[PDB]
Nucleic acid binder design. Structure first.
Lengths: 97, 101, 101, 97
DNA sequence: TTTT
DNA sequence: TTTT
DNA sequence: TTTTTTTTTT
DNA sequence: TTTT
DNA sequence: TTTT
DNA sequence: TTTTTTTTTT
């Protein structure tokens, strides 16, 4: 029984690097992933996936990616009145030339 | 330039919700409890609850064959939506589902 | 009781091999170079070379649109075969492919 | 650019636990995964996937699973005249009641 | 060389 | 506000 | 630039 | 609150 | 015996 | 027990 996600998209904003009171880096990025087909009106829409990164992954994503950066992410769908649902990234690939 | 896929194995929290669009298309809403590998501070196994939408025959078949409790394997893509008091939803749109009971 | 899925993003090592069964079905053979995340003892990036089989329109389309070098995203399942001097093959049978160029 | 595999099948043999000359446990299991449809003759065939496990994963798989055990595995397709291609498992789940 |  |  | 479909409510 |  |  | 198809050579 597992939970696995592969996304490659583009960051909609500079990554949001914060630190927990314990000292752990944690970042929130949102990935625009265009679809592969057009809708009735002939347009390509994107899905906007919120991913949360931790520690070194978070710091490095922040260092090396801005708004617009092409990024690969794998991880799991996590879920946390407040009904939130994100991808918890364990590895990030930087794909900017 | 872009890619979006997901694979999941989990149990249905409730019987599937089988509806038809006024066009005539079957669509189903299902929520999967996916138990984590690790444990918490109390030594318990928490699950993540992922909402999946199914379409056409997949919707009907999972309706017909699975119910609350059914172990199900799903592959598809994450999709995001807003509706209206404006809400943000992220689901998995299932392409296939495997009945694992 | 069972489940088998794979997702892959890699580059084609050669133009796709488009054939037709004597039934009339398009089928394509493609090998994907999937570069690893880590590095070796020399600090180089090695790739894994995964053979994928495509069918019907997917075979034709990937034939028509991709060539040696094309970045491609694939999802499907692992399948195993023996033929005849008897050989053991494991491939990925692609359900979908995304053209990522 | 990634490589991810989810299998849940049944071991065809007791796991093959060996140790490298350095001391690392390494195991080779083969997973029977039945398909979901019948072939022309009305039969369900299986795919037999060779997976290689390392270290603690290898030792634990050996300890707790025999021929017949239901097992979940995620990992990547690895490839190594000798033309071999397996799944390199990073996590194994034991699903035997 | 293939499992319930 | 959820499954075994 | 394409797959089977790319389509509803919550 | 959405990217090339 | 392979891709960027 | 079902999805679109469950079908070839290497």
């Amino acid at each position: 029984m597992f939970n696995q996600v592969m996304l490659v998209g583009r960051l909609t904003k500079d990554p949001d690097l914060r630190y927990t009171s314990a000292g752990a880096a944690v970042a929130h990025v949102t990935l625009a992933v265009n679809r592969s087909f057009k809708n009735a009106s002939g347009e390509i829409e994107a899905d906007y996936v919120n991913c949360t990164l931790w520690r070194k992954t978070a710091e490095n994503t922040a260092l090396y990616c801005q708004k617009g950066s092409l990024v690969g992410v794998s991880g799991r769908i996590q879920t946390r009145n407040v009904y939130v649902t994100e991808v918890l990234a364990d590895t990030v690939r930087f794909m900017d030339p």
